[PDB]
Amino acid sequence: GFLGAAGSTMGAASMTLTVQARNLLSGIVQQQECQQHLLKLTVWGIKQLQARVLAVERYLRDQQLLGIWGCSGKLICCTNVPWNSTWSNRNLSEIWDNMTWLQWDKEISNYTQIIYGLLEESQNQQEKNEQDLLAL
Amino acid sequence: GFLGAAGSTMGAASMTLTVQARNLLSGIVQECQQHLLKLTVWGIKQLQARVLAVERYLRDQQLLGIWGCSGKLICCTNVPWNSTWSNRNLSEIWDNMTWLQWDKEISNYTQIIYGLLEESQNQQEKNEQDLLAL
Amino acid sequence: GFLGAAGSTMGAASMTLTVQARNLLSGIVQQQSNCQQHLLKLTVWGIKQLQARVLAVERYLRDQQLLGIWGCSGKLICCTNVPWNSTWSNRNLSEIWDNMTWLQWDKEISNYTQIIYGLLEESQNQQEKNEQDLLAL
Amino acid sequence: ENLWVTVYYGVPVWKDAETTLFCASDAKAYETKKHNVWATHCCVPTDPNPQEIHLENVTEEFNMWKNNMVEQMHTDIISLWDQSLKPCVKLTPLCVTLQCTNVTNNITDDMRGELKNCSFNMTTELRDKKQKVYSLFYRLDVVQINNKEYRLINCNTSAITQACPKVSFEPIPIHYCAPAGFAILKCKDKKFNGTGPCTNVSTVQCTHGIKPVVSTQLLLNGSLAEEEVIIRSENITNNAKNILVQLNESVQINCTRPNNNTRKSIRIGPGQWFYATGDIIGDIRQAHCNVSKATWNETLGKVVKQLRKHFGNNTIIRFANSSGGDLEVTTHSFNCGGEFFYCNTSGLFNSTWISITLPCRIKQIINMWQRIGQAMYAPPIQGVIRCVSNITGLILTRDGGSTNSTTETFRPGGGDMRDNWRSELYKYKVVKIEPLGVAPTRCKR
Amino acid sequence: AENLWVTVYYGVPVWKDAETTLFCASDAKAYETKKHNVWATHCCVPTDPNPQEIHLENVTEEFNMWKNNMVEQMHTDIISLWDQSLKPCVKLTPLCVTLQCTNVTNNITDDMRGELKNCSFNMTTELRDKKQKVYSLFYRLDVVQINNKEYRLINCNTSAITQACPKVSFEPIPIHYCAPAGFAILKCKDKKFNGTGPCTNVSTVQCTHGIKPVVSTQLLLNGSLAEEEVIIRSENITNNAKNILVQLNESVQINCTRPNNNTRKSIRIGPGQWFYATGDIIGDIRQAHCNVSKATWNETLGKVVKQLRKHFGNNTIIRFANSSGGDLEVTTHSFNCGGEFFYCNTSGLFNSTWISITLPCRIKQIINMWQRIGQAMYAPPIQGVIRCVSNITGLILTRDGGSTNSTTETFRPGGGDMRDNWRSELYKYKVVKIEPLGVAPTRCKR
Amino acid sequence: NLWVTVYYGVPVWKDAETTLFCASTKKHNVWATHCCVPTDPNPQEIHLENVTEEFNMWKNNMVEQMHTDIISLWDQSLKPCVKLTPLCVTLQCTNVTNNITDRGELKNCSFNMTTELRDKKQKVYSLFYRLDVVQINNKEYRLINCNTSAITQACPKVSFEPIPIHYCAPAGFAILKCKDKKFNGTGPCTNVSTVQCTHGIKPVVSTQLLLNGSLAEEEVIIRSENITNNAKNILVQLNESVQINCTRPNNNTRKSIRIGPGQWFYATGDIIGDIRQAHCNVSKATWNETLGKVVKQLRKHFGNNTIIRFANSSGGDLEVTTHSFNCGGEFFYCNTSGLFNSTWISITLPCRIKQIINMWQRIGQAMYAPPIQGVIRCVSNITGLILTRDGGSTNSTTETFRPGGGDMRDNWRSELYKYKVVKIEPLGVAPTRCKR
Numbered sequence A: 001g002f003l004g005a006a007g008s009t010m011g012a013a014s015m016t017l018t019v020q021a022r023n024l025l026s027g028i029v030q031q032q033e034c035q036q037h038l039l040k041l042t043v044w045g046i047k048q049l050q051a052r053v054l055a056v057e058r059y060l061r062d063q064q065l066l067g068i069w070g071c072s073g074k075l076i077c078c079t080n081v082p083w084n085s086t087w088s089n090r091n092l093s094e095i096w097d098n099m100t101w102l103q104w105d106k107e108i109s110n111y112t113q114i115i116y117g118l119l120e121e122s123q124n125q126q127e128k129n130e131q132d133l134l135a136l
Numbered sequence B: 001g002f003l004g005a006a007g008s009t010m011g012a013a014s015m016t017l018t019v020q021a022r023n024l025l026s027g028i029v030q031e032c033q034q035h036l037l038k039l040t041v042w043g044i045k046q047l048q049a050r051v052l053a054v055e056r057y058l059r060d061q062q063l064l065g066i067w068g069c070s071g072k073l074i075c076c077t078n079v080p081w082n083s084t085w086s087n088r089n090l091s092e093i094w095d096n097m098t099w100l101q102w103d104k105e106i107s108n109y110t111q112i113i114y115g116l117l118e119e120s121q122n123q124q125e126k127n128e129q130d131l132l133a134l
Numbered sequence C: 001g002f003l004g005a006a007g008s009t010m011g012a013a014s015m016t017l018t019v020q021a022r023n024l025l026s027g028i029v030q031q032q033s034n035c036q037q038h039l040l041k042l043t044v045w046g047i048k049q050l051q052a053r054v055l056a057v058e059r060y061l062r063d064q065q066l067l068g069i070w071g072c073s074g075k076l077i078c079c080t081n082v083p084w085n086s087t088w089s090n091r092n093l094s095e096i097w098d099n100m101t102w103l104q105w106d107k108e109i110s111n112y113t114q115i116i117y118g119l120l121e122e123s124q125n126q127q128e129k130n131e132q133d134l135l136a137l
Numbered sequence D: 001e002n003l004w005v006t007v008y009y010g011v012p013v014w015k016d017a018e019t020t021l022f023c024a025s026d027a028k029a030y031e032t033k034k035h036n037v038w039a040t041h042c043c044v045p046t047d048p049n050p051q052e053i054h055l056e057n058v059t060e061e062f063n064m065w066k067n068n069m070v071e072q073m074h075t076d077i078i079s080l081w082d083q084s085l086k087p088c089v090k091l092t093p094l095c096v097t098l099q100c101t102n103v104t105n106n107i108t109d110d111m112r113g114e115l116k117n118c119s120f121n122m123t124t125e126l127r128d129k130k131q132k133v134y135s136l137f138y139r140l141d142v143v144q145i146n147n148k149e150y151r152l153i154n155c156n157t158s159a160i161t162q163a164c165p166k167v168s169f170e171p172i173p174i175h176y177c178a179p180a181g182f183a184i185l186k187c188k189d190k191k192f193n194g195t196g197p198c199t200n201v202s203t204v205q206c207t208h209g210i211k212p213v214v215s216t217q218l219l220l221n222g223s224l225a226e227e228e229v230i231i232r233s234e235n236i237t238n239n240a241k242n243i244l245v246q247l248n249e250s251v252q253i254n255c256t257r258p259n260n261n262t263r264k265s266i267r268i269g270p271g272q273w274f275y276a277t278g279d280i281i282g283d284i285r286q287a288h289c290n291v292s293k294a295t296w297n298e299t300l301g302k303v304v305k306q307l308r309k310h311f312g313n314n315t316i317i318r319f320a321n322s323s324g325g326d327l328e329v330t331t332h333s334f335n336c337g338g339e340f341f342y343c344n345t346s347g348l349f350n351s352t353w354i355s356i357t358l359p360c361r362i363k364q365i366i367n368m369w370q371r372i373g374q375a376m377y378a379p380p381i382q383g384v385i386r387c388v389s390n391i392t393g394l395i396l397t398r399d400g401g402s403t404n405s406t407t408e409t410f411r412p413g414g415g416d417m418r419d420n421w422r423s424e425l426y427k428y429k430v431v432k433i434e435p436l437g438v439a440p441t442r443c444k445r
Numbered sequence E: 001a002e003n004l005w006v007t008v009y010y011g012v013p014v015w016k017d018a019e020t021t022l023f024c025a026s027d028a029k030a031y032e033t034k035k036h037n038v039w040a041t042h043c044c045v046p047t048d049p050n051p052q053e054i055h056l057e058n059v060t061e062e063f064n065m066w067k068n069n070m071v072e073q074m075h076t077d078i079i080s081l082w083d084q085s086l087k088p089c090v091k092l093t094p095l096c097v098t099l100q101c102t103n104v105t106n107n108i109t110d111d112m113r114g115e116l117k118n119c120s121f122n123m124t125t126e127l128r129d130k131k132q133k134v135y136s137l138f139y140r141l142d143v144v145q146i147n148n149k150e151y152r153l154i155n156c157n158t159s160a161i162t163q164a165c166p167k168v169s170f171e172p173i174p175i176h177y178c179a180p181a182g183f184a185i186l187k188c189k190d191k192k193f194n195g196t197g198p199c200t201n202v203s204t205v206q207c208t209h210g211i212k213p214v215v216s217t218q219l220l221l222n223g224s225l226a227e228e229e230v231i232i233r234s235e236n237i238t239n240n241a242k243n244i245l246v247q248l249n250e251s252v253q254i255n256c257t258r259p260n261n262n263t264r265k266s267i268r269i270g271p272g273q274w275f276y277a278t279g280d281i282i283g284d285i286r287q288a289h290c291n292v293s294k295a296t297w298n299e300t301l302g303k304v305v306k307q308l309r310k311h312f313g314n315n316t317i318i319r320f321a322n323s324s325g326g327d328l329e330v331t332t333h334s335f336n337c338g339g340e341f342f343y344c345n346t347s348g349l350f351n352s353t354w355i356s357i358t359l360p361c362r363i364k365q366i367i368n369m370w371q372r373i374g375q376a377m378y379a380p381p382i383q384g385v386i387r388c389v390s391n392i393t394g395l396i397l398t399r400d401g402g403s404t405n406s407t408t409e410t411f412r413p414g415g416g417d418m419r420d421n422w423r424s425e426l427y428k429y430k431v432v433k434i435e436p437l438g439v440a441p442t443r444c445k446r
Numbered sequence F: 001n002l003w004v005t006v007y008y009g010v011p012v013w014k015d016a017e018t019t020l021f022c023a024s025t026k027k028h029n030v031w032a033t034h035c036c037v038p039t040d041p042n043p044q045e046i047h048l049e050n051v052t053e054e055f056n057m058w059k060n061n062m063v064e065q066m067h068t069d070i071i072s073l074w075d076q077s078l079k080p081c082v083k084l085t086p087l088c089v090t091l092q093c094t095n096v097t098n099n100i101t102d103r104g105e106l107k108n109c110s111f112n113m114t115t116e117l118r119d120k121k122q123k124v125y126s127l128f129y130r131l132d133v134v135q136i137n138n139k140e141y142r143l144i145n146c147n148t149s150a151i152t153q154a155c156p157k158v159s160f161e162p163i164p165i166h167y168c169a170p171a172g173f174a175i176l177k178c179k180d181k182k183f184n185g186t187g188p189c190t191n192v193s194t195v196q197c198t199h200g201i202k203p204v205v206s207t208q209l210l211l212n213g214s215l216a217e218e219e220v221i222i223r224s225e226n227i228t229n230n231a232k233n234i235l236v237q238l239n240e241s242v243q244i245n246c247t248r249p250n251n252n253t254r255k256s257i258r259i260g261p262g263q264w265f266y267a268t269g270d271i272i273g274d275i276r277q278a279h280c281n282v283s284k285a286t287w288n289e290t291l292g293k294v295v296k297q298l299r300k301h302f303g304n305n306t307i308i309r310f311a312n313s314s315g316g317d318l319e320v321t322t323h324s325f326n327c328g329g330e331f332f333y334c335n336t337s338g339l340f341n342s343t344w345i346s347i348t349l350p351c352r353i354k355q356i357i358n359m360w361q362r363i364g365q366a367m368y369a370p371p372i373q374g375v376i377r378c379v380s381n382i383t384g385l386i387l388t389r390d391g392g393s394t395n396s397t398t399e400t401f402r403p404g405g406g407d408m409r410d411n412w413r414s415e416l417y418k419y420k421v422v423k424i425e426p427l428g429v430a431p432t433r434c435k436r
Ligand SMILES: *[C@@H]1O[C@H](CO)[C@@H](O[C@@H]2O[C@H](CO)[C@@H](O[C@@H]3O[C@H](CO[C@H]4O[C@H](CO)[C@@H](O)[C@H](O)[C@@H]4O)[C@@H](O)[C@H](O[C@H]4O[C@H](CO)[C@@H](O)[C@H](O)[C@@H]4O[C@H]4O[C@H](CO)[C@@H](O)[C@H](O)[C@@H]4O)[C@@H]3O)[C@H](O)[C@H]2NC(C)=O)[C@H](O)[C@H]1NC(C)=O
Pocket: D033, D165, D166, D168, D170, D171, D213, D220, D221, D335, D336, D337, D338, D381, D382, D386, D387, D388, D389, D390
């Protein structure tokens, strides 16, 4: 039931986050004769390595962002960045019980970079302030 | 002494977790170099070997992340033992047994346990999200 | 502005740590224009670029693992319980965070780096064990 | 002011993407005989139970005319094909002056001039020795120099290689499978148009098995959809686009080469052999295909009934045969039994709306229409051959510049290989999974 | 919970059987000098000057040399390197012509009569419109008669032949196989390990001992020597369809020679394409041969039989016999010395029934190196004379199971499958993978 | 008292060797084709204030990569084209004596070559330059490389006209650029700007005189690894370009001869009109001034009262004794003795044309440059010189310099001298006032 959602509301879909997360890496190692034959296809072999290397790079890119924003190790992360009514002028019942994530993304795709920049800035300030308070 | 703890009891062997943890990324540090680029087949086989080593490393880190143990070599959970997985007392598990023996003893329950750890962590995050709302 | 802080005070440069960290893993920002299927024919260049990409990933992961082992995962400015040994740099704190940059500073430390890493690893091992027993009460 | 950004990872969303898919097989193709191009390439079996996931409420937009999976399949097939010839014998030594006659003996009049009996001086395994040998050739591959002296058709243009005598090109069904991080969505709408939204979407790991069958004009051994004949095209209105017609019932076509061939092997170098066509045993008769008129007339009537929806219920619809050009375009190019047929289909498109024997030519030196500059020589097959195939679709084009709107003319056409795959891959789309997203919630650190 | 929860550990010292890609490591000093050695230029990872070994206390590990995937790895790597060594050099297709020849009769001893042929032929030059007449000597095993004086090279009907590169050495140099991170090699140290079953002295290494990729049949040369006694290893012993690999605890020295003083000539056959021909022999023409000390060999078989009897019975008669029929590559002691190929007759070593030996040798220049069929290599001649000194470290024997009874067992030389030459060195090693995660019960809870 | 703090993202680097990549209507241009990954058109240079760094152009591995990549690309471009093995036959030659502006430079050779059929031949003829034709044993000739190597035909679509290329660092690496004025390739400098890619560098191939490079800011700069050691080359970069106008005045035509199935050979056809000498015109006044400037700067390193003499080249093949020049698609070998014949205290240089080129990337393989129809005119900038000292003399009164070079790496070193590759090492440790 990998994409068992996307036909459910945003709220309901929060119950499948682990399933989606585990599609990468586990789905790669899992790939596990003539597999030796295929090593004679130089172009083919290079293309397959490029695909695997790229999948790893994509995975790590996203993990680094969670690191930067202070959400490392979590599937659900609360932050200190407030929501702007201009990004989306909708209420909680309105989106959580009606939109399906695919729709949501389409409606707020214009603010993606803005939001990410804000998340980084809040984390930068928080980390420094905590270290300064630790030192008496 | 990379596998030096292999004959140690499970308890004693807990003191070498960093010895084994470091192997995956330190070992990969491993005229020449340029000559071998001509051996197209070795080029591909060695890249496949290195790429896979990375993929396996990350797969395991992802699981520790999912279970809520990121950054720890040893982590506690809220998932209990069923006593069917292993009907033994601690004095005959941590002592008088090695990790190799233990892994064989409970290998049939590996997937069950992992599934339980995942569900428990998901519930725990869900209850931090609502708590922070009060 | 990737190395912009190279000429700055060590304590001032602490404000660009996410700039340098982010560009170690530039991501998939480099684009592929259409050719490309052409470049795959240059077997040797194909292999050399894969080697370059794999290495960059491995270097990244090795550094992250060390922060993991030392208990600084997810942090850029993490402190620990290993005391500073004055032989490593016989100057006061005020002579470190200012009047010098990060270049220069690493030359002051030199070969003491290996010692520090060993100390950090053992300390974390003990900290985890102590927490494991506290949770038993 | 109380809503905050919450970051989620593992969000079930996706975006359109272009990636590299890998091929997979049923295992059995390699487990049993191998020695064929697709069994050898597709080394990874599919899962025995590649269960799809139905997506409740999901509506997605598909466009078969921009489908990257088609473009990849085209490229992969050509590459595979070339790599299957790479290790075999070059036939350069045959590009000599030949001494040819008309065969004459036991020929039905329809076959006069089709075969030629040619003698030539070819090398032996030793550099300093030659042998005089002879073989039969089909007329189509032999071109007159300057009345007995002939050259092979490829000598002034291309290199020629011999197809490997032990390698089959049988269209064993293969499956395309997504890499992790990607998914293949498929449209289950029985009447899907080829473009636009589809409201019945499932997610799969691998596509259905697709037989990589090569043909032109008439599409063989594909899907019949389920309920009705569907006419789909990129434009419809613009006559320049090919119209792909999918039938809801197959038409069985019976093809044969009646002449009992033999084969001789000529040594041409150390470790190398040339496969030559030997004398025909028994009578010489013309190759042909049979279409039952009983089904063909009804089948076209159904096509017309649906075709009218775009042209008018009082419009005259005329079918006509092909225009000029190479046989790969003007005739039904057909690869079967290991030999290459070029069948004359004009007997199938000769009607106006408001058994049929198609004679066939045989060719051995093939400029596989993937490209020009490399010719393949197909070794002859001994005995006789018979093929029974399912016609599952047609490729038709329209005549632009028509005198008036009263009459439209449809002819067999196209032939570009992409349309032979586009017709099976039309229902699949590749997307990339994007686990990050944000939404407002009421929680703060 | 009965006060127990699942604690997750990472870095747990547990391993499982695995198959992975290994890499080729080297001494890196002998290798700087040996710039043209096939296994030197292609085996670049330097080994640790001080290799480590960790003894594992209280570990019992099951080994099986007959299912050891390191053997397949070594086999395929050797074949690949072999192919890549010949790939860049001249194809000798132009030499596959009718030859005209008679026998070399000058200064021939009786043993060499009919062994060498003097052949002339019409060959190309750097200009396509010119020809040259040249001549060279051939061994009778490389040349086949065309059906009185006309001959062709033996490979002329089955495969084009590639000349071995004149500067490339095929001298075995020790090779170390090393595991990638995440993997480990477990080495069995037990004395008298017979190839299968549990081993109680197990240590972990990163790299194997250096193994010389020596290629030979019947008699295994320059391998590891057993420490305590003769060890007889076989997958089954009882099954007469399998080989028996016998490892000696004492080496037997064998001295081989090719006494004829050869010369060489370089003939241009095309645009920078040179062929190396064998020229006239200087001095007398004599047969190549090998010397095995008689007493040492007789005592050595004595020791082998004493151990062999343990599986066949104290009152069973044990007889040795020579090889059966088949190609020279499988019936004689083939080996590569100095770059030339010897096919020595070992029947003088296996002729006894129990309750200095000179072996004549043949030389062949066209080598169907058994990596496969359908390819061939031409070995350029070596100028001067050669002398080979080598150690017999083990035997490959089979049982004559055709039809027999309890009275007697017969053993005769066999082999020919090169993988057995590597099983004999790799039998002590196993590849395993490391699996750092695991769980265990404990009193501790979040 | 103070505690250990571990930092990540520290802006500190170390010298390193890594692989760089080449980023770059001309669909058949080699540089355009195999280096096609454009970067942002606006490189972002970062000035590093208070940063001093050490450069050494003689140990710069960026040079080795440029050298290796060029060879590799060169070989790949010729990989798919027709071999000319069938032309290595005895040739029957005459002396091409019509309309020679007086001789013997060209030969008109007839030969027997095959047609597309294995059993048929054709008699064809073509012109060759004398430099590529060697006498057998007075009418019979061979091509010069028949006894050494296979000759392949250059692909007659493909252009090698240089397109500036840029070498770019992979992530985790950075390129440091030294902008100090009068930087002489070695030692510390203080501008040190940080770039993602180098400036565009044209991979121009030449010997003795360097063409189309940068101009040393505002002064003539003399660079050498040792100066004292006469076995080393001296690279001189000029502050002004010297213009040189080159031509190949003969109006050529071209024949295309079927050489095998699907294959064609390009032969030089008859010359239309007079047959004349190829040559280059160096402005004479500019050249005189240019040497005077070089001498002033060169002299300060040998003695303020010593005398400097220029002399022409010594022994070796044309590749090193003449000015090797690749332009318009043809290979010119210009006689530079007229440029280096003076003692301190339009110049027409005749040029030879060669078609079979042992491009000095290596020995053992050769390229045949097909002829170009019409006439060729080239205009280029002399930006630097490669000189050697005529050592072994003890008479310190006068130093003598001669043109040298031939080692292609020196032509790259002269552009890449200001760049260094370093790796970034983000972890570091420093003391603080707190503990977790
Ligand atoms: C649309 O879909 C249909 C149905 O799949 C397809 O038609 C079938 O095509 C295949 C391939 O051309 C035909 O298979 C061949 O059949 C002949 C005839 O065998 C008869 O007798 C045997 C007796 O045991 C029966 O089992 C069999 O069913 C038939 O009644 C076989 O001789 C062929 O064997 C050769 O090829 C095999 C490939 O794997 C080899 O393994 C085998 O050893 C044979 O090769 C060797 O011998 C040959 C001499 O015979 C020699 O020429 C070769 O070089 C080599 O040495 C093969 O099994 C099948 O019968 C067709 N089915 C029908 C109903 O006609 C259409 O082709 C497809 N349409 C399109 C356009 O693709």
